[PDB]
């Protein structure tokens, strides 16, 4: 997507796939996926329970990346409905919808 604001979307598309890979690395750190309650906290604060000797990362398990464009913070949620995780960023208008740059941009795995 090579247009103003969509150019912010195309960056985040690589960043979200980055997070999805690191969430798989938290999957390794706690030999399991986080829960949308305990594991969300365990994505922001060290996981309570038994994590393996692995360097835990906050912010939802991210790479060496800043936050998403438009000054929005990443929304990282753990398995909601059917899917092992839910992560996304809000669109340029601060809303989760379907659009180019006004869409919620994220990815997850189910």
Q: Per 3-state DSSP, what percentage of the chain is helix, strand, and coil (rounded to 5)?
A: 30, 10, 65
Q: Give the integer Cα–Cα distance in Å for 84 and 109.
A: 6
CATH number at residue 62: 3.30.700.10
Domain count across the chain = 1
Structure tokens that stand for 38 in this block = 């305990």
Residue 96 belongs to what domain range?
1-108
Total Cβ atoms within 10 A of residue 80 = 12
Q: What is the DSSP string of 53-92?
A: SS---STTT--S--PPSTTPPPEEE---SSSS-EEEE--T
**87 vs 80: CA distance, rounded Å:** 10
């Amino acid at each position: 997507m090579s247009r103003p604001d969509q150019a912010k979307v195309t960056v985040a598309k690589g960043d979200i796939k980055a997070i999805a890979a690191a969430l798989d690395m938290y999957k390794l750190d706690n030999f399991a996926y986080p829960s949308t309650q305990q594991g969300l906290e365990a994505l922001v604060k060290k996981p309570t329970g038994n994590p393996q000797p692995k360097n835990w990362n906050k912010d939802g398990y991210l790479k060496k990346l800043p936050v998403d464009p438009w000054g929005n913070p990443y929304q990282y949620l753990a398995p909601g409905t059917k899917g092992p995780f839910d992560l996304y960023s809000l669109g340029a208008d601060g809303k989760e919808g379907g659009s180019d740059n006004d869409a919620d941009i994220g990815n997850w795995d189910n």
